[PDB]
Design a protein around this ligand. Structure first.
Ligand SMILES: Cc1nc2c(s1)c1cnn(Cc3ccc(O)cc3)c(=O)c1n2C
Ligand SMILES: O=P(O)(O)OC[C@H]1O[C@](O)(COP(=O)(O)O)[C@@H](O)[C@@H]1O
Ligand SMILES: O=P(O)(O)OC[C@H]1O[C@](O)(COP(=O)(O)O)[C@@H](O)[C@@H]1O
Ligand SMILES: O=P(O)(O)OC[C@H]1O[C@](O)(COP(=O)(O)O)[C@@H](O)[C@@H]1O
Ligand SMILES: O=P(O)(O)OC[C@H]1O[C@](O)(COP(=O)(O)O)[C@@H](O)[C@@H]1O
Ligand SMILES: [K+]
Ligand SMILES: [K+]
Ligand SMILES: [Mn+2]
Ligand SMILES: [Mn+2]
Ligand SMILES: [Mn+2]
Ligand SMILES: [Mn+2]
Lengths: 446, 509, 468, 515
């Protein structure tokens, strides 16, 4: 079973290797990946990526999260950016089976001798020399309030140095902002040393390599990146790799060999999301940069050694009596046995999708939700493909479950994620409401 | 408890160092016990005590006894077994297996002069002239299968003779080990390609008897080739299509052609008695472990047999070697262990069943589960069969929650067998309407069969849930489940076998 | 290929099992040493010669029966049988002599002498745990051993009779003491003290016979030279279905510690009366070798039975097959990982030589040693290649039988004038010995382990040589 | 710890990652050799002295440009810079000289600065009619490779000028290939052509390569980077042009196109090593697939025990800037973690403004990456994958590496004539430095290809007794290691020698304490 032609795509020969060395030796440039790209793409909004028509092209190219850099720009500037992103996003809502949710992330200005990205020794950086600035500014507080008022999904918190820095952020978001995800940016030596306590109170991490590369020796950034990716992977919390991934594409139509390798290796490290800064904020090829990250991620996701990664994630995760976790790991294992084209999961808060994503299945996790915010926020979790369901409930709940599953199948077919004859794993619960996921089924498509 | 520190170890060496004589087993015994029926074990009262002690499969040795004798054994077994049918929540199915006589080469008191000279003839005139320097055998082709230098063992391999010459009179032999030969006693032709028929005529009448009396399993003696298995299945006829054929590997050719035999069998018996004569005794453990390992790989049941607790025929306690042999068979991966003389004729048949049960529980907890499961996972090929996909998903889920059990609904047993091959720590509670399948699934380690008796409900989904609740209630009464426990439930999307495709995580109430 | 080498190269333990082959023939060199108990069936010089040829490496003197004069006769007959082969040095097999202590023993319903009231020698299991009395039973006899598993006992860690027996062993130059019913580290120190300064070179093997010994195993092992899993008494002290747990635990911890371990009792019991063992008994011997046992033991099979030599031959035949079936790939990896890093050039050289031998499927590792330590550090990493140890010390040649896979050759010639020449002559003596014994053939690779200067403690050199 | 040893001891790769420590400084010497391309920014004797001190191990001469006299000047200044350290033999660093051939090329025709625009969606004809050699324009391009009309089927593509312009063959006709412009651009004269996925008929050697290869032999270059190697016969043609006098020269095959990737195994078997020529590879196959080819090729050379080089744009931004980008520093680190024996600088040292700082950056990155290797799984997999062998040099090598790990040996000192004994130690990736003592100056330079080998040139004449000569070179290796910081008093070393003179008889491993 499993056709001979199907077994030579998606780097499946390298997938069945008994050793990592053989896994490397069997990687094949003719082995084509699936269309579903698991690693989400964060694009920074700026002069080059602010118009509604430009944003439409970046959505089709693969942008999942739009980053607002509050280091620059008035609230009126950012309100117009949010208005333009939402206009381009909703411009596709007339076609539910192809609609792509897009999250909006607010990046704080933060606490802002080296000058000019650390280019001249004596933006300004003071490495080692511990300085005084508090966790949250008084302009940060006004910016975060702007985030709640305009309904942003994610906060990128700059220069997080300790757990209390995160709590100050969460306090500024307020009770109405309790649902916003907080990604703590690790930007200096202190944040690295206090990483374990920062991660426990955050929803995720951004390896902010720009400032980190000035605050610590440039030779050491990859050590910090691979440490933080593994620790969030172990913790099952999303991790973002950022800064200068395709830097030369600011002026050039094609990246360097080091840049494509950097995106690929960030994906192989286990990063949930990869980021573009000047490549989309200022550069001359914002859409091409998005297209390049999409293409590399597809290749690198197939080149992950899932065999060992799944085993180690399984051994490191503690035993659980939560039926959502138990169902998730079983569905992921079941998906590996059949190379299921997808895991289709129903979720309202996104947790069931995240618990599937944390075991890193090869199969795409197609998440059908009625919550527009959850559809935006699950882009943080690798391999989750969110579908916004818009119909009012069927009268029998079981019929309403089945129709959402069918909606996931129909959207997967249209997008090239699913074909007739594919096996799919379907994850649901035994009753409506969040928290009751406990069922895994094996279905053939059509 | 249950050797959890040893099972979590990073290495096998540390797993060994963490084994704990004070850590008590709490899981139910998963290795099935086969007990040979004989004079010590034909009492209905004794059979009831053997059921409660742990007997899962009753073996009828057709090497001896008439059809009427075995019909009585069958009737006493079923009476003892059905005596528990009034409480369906605790009723234990018990399989009945027919072990065939098989091709038995036989001779014609006279002493075998060690180092002497004895000839073994084929001529029919010498069938009654047996003595110190004449032996006759009913196998005519013995003269064409054992060359010069090959050996001929007699009476359980304690008297040996080597071929020195070949000639018209017969085979010219010399006595290697001495003894005195009786009247028509067992002969073995080690290493030689014995081309006796794959089925005696006695075997064909016995297999017809077994079909007529509804036996669940055939232990097929001296299986050397795939065609030997097909000969057995032919004699069962398609009236015996549902009977499971377990092939007894008993000689050198069977070990060599094992893979061809396993492919056409439902399982294997490591018949160490005959095998220990047909090949050197010091090589039997190699063949045992090879066969157990490859049946584990193929997901097919394997039985370890013969002399596991031999001294308990006359003594109330086993030796240290016998204790270790039973334990190491479980550690090897054997689905079933067997008692022969210990239950057929010995003085402590119940105590022998109790011992095997007690040893099996300790060994099952001493298994290095971490490496076993990982290796069975990677070795089992990718599959698009939904029952296969659900089974491995279910075993994975059971490990994550430390599930008390995996409840599975099954018509033929296959869905339980596909769970069993991944060796979950959780018990596989199999709920079936098929009384025969309830008995036959004892061959698969870790499956606990429950026979469902109620007639079908009007709504199919109501009938599914009733069966699931039947497994819940049986599990609670037998000690497998507690309130607050998590269980994995495996079902299908439509009636009939072959459509298993659902795995659920449920809390017990 | 032979030696189960296809199974040796499997990537998983499951495939290792799957590839085992009854037609794959093993190497003549048998690594697991055989201990045979001396008794009426194994006492004549002519019978001991047959058991030496059959494969007996250590002679066990059971000091629970027989007088001091009786055991001197046994010692004298063993040394006469052993030295009867000394005239051919290339084939001389050293044999060690082990003293097994009586230990704390309680010998012989109303227990306070017939079949209604039983007298005992100490203020309940009798007949090797076959009869149960409680303040379940069978048929008794006269003079019986009594086990009391549970309530704690007032017998000392070393009796006066035991002390007298230990001093007998020093005076008669035994190589090994099997210390009965060791429960604590203090019990071993008591044996080391009764052996005195004149007996400081004797190896103390602690016998684990009860629940307390299992519990305090780590502290007992740390002060012992090795361990005997005494399954006879241990099988009466703890439930019979749990002895296999204690055996495998103890064999694993000794293998990790690098100290020898003995598996004993009823391994081939039915051969006391029958010429062939049962299927369970050959499995128990094979599984003891697969567990990692350095030595296997025969007691009644050689002491009192009617087939003592055939019993030695059976253990020899099984051990060879089981040794080849060991999954060295995973065992060596796990031994390397668990052993701490070392700055000792002897241990550093040892693990390199074992690795090198696996790479070339070397027929043997030839090591020069005086105390035996260089050979033990090789044995510790469980190579498939035979460890041929050439030594001038007769005692080391006997005692090194405790370590699995060490084949001792006693070298007798005075030193050559150039020490480099004296080294080569001893290496050559091992090569010639291995050729005659069938360990080596022309074209084989061997690993030669020596040191850079004379005297113990300087092993630091590993050489790859092809046999001419 | 230091050395990232808590991470290397971890039981899983996941926990190994979590335990990487930015505050754990490396103490072992840098094992991945650095190749620096010689050019205007690196041709002066004093600048080359700076780069040798910064860590340059191999000097790359790019015969794609420059005259024979130009490259002979490059060789003279390199050798003058290298030999200015020879007066202190205990610290003299051999520096290899590698010749990178221009290789077979396909180029367009001459239309001065005359330029034309190939418009997107246009119709352009590619012809090799010698009458069209000069008649280039916006709908017609000539190329100097006549078999182009046979190797590019309809729907196949033709790239021009570093892949800036893309053409798709629509029909095969008598005049040539009629193509539609897929990606437009401005076309100059004599621009390079690439035929992605095509089986290119060009010989393994251009006629200029033959001349350059003889120049290399006559000037004693140590290494050849053979361009555009697509099959075993290409390597054979390179070998033949070097002749018997160039038989000691090492041949590193540059894998540059799709065929070379697919036929990698037959190429590697007849090669001394491989270069992942990512620059050309990224034009010949999709850019997002290059990392697949890099990791496959590094793994298969790791498995075969043959050196592998990763090249192109590793620190590209440092051509104009004193600090690399975050992507570039990660690219160097990940090439080392892949298992690359060498890393390369091209424009960063040939023409950039910071050549010495680029060499310093690669040295500092590689030192961090080498300690961040999950050594436990790497050595275990290399060990089990390496087959059984009855060759005593192979047996001694794995024995020495195992012993080095057991004692955390500071170094493995090995005596070698050709370098093979050092290479056999290097293939098992020990963390101990492999200190190779040789009398051959060429072998000393060439073993820089093998990761973890640190060559020392022995200059003394042979002692009377051979056993004295061996011990002298061993002590020379010890005294060199002490002076260079490899070895301290009280350290343990693994010394690897043989039983008789001449190469091929390595069979002894010794454990020694230093001083
Ligand atoms: C999901 C996983 N990712 C990795 C794994 S598992 C792994 C395991 N081992 N090693 C070291 C090694 C081993 C063999 C080689 O040929 C090269 C490197 C790795 O680097 C390595 N990675 C990056
Ligand atoms: O991931 P979440 O937020 O816990 O939601 C999972 C829930 O979705 C469902 O599948 C469907 O629930 P709804 O019909 O209320 O959307 C439930 O069975 C399950 O509890
Ligand atoms: O294990 P088997 O023999 O394939 O049978 C499993 C079958 O049992 C069921 O759960 C119920 O079967 P029935 O209702 O026909 O008894 C099916 O859904 C499933 O196909
Ligand atoms: O194992 P031991 O007792 O430490 O002896 C090993 C010793 O044997 C030798 O190989 C030879 O020593 P001798 O010549 O004194 O017997 C030494 O080089 C080495 O130190
Ligand atoms: O690595 P290579 O080229 O095979 O050479 C290793 C050789 O080096 C030697 O030490 C030779 O020493 P010489 O330089 O004196 O010839 C031999 O022992 C060994 O055969
Ligand atoms: K039978
Ligand atoms: K070039
Ligand atoms: Mn920053
Ligand atoms: Mn039989
Ligand atoms: Mn005892
Ligand atoms: Mn090129």
């Amino acid at each position: 079973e499993l056709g001979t032609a199907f077994f030579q795509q998606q780097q499946l020969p390298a997938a069945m290797a008994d050793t990592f060395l053989e896994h490397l030796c069997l990687l094949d440039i003719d082995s084509e990946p699936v269309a579903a790209r698991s690693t989400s793409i964060i694009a920074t909004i700026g002069p080059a990526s602010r118009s509604v028509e430009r944003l439409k092209e970046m959505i089709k190219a693969g942008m999942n999260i739009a980053r607002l850099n509050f280091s620059h720009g008035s609230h009126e500037y950012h309100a117009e950016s949010i208005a333009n992103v939402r206009e381009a996003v909703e411009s596709f809502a007339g076609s539910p089976l192809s609609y792509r949710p897009v999250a909006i992330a607010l990046d704080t200005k933060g606490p802002e001798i080296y000058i000019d990205d650390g280019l001249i020794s004596l933006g300004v950086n003071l490495p080692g020399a511990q300085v005084d600035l508090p966790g949250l500014s008084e302009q940060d507080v006004r910016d975060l309030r702007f985030g709640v008022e305009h309904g942003v999904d994610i906060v990128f918190a700059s220069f997080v140095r300790k757990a209390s820095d995160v709590a100050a952020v969460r306090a500024a978001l307020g009770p109405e902002g309790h649902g916003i995800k907080i990604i703590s940016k690790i930007e200096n030596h202190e944040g690295v040393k206090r990483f374990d306590e920062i991660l426990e109170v955050s929803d995720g991490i951004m390896v902010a390599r720009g400032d980190l590369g000035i605050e610590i020796p440039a030779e050491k950034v990859f050590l910090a990146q691979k440490m933080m990716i593994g620790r969030c992977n172990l913790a099952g919390k999303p991790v973002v790799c950022a800064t200068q991934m395709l830097e030369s594409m600011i002026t050039k139509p094609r990246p360097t060999r080091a840049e494509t390798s950097d995106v690929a290796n960030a994906v192989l490290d286990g990063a949930d999301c990869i980021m573009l800064s000047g490549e989309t904020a200022k550069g001359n090829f914002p859409v091409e940069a998005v297209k390049m990250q999409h293409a590399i991620a597809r290749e690198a996701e197939a080149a992950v050694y899932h065999r060992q990664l799944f085993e180690e994630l399984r051994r490191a995760a503690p035993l659980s009596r939560d039926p959502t976790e138990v169902t998730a790991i079983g569905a992921v294992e079941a998906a590996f046995k059949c190379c299921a084209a997808a895991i289709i999961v129903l979720t309202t808060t996104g947790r069931s999708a995240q618990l599937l994503s944390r075991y890193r299945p090869r199969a795409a996790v197609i998440a059908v939700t009625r919550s527009a915010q959850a559809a935006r926020q699950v882009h943080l979790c690798r391999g989750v493909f969110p579908l916004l369901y818009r119909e009012p409930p069927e009268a029998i709940w079981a019929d309403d479950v089945d129709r959402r599953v069918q909606f996931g199948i129909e959207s997967g077919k249209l997008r090239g994620f699913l074909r007739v004859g594919d096996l799919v794993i379907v994850v649901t619960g035994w009753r409506p409401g969040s928290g009751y996921t406990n069922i895994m089924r094996v279905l053939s498509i059509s």
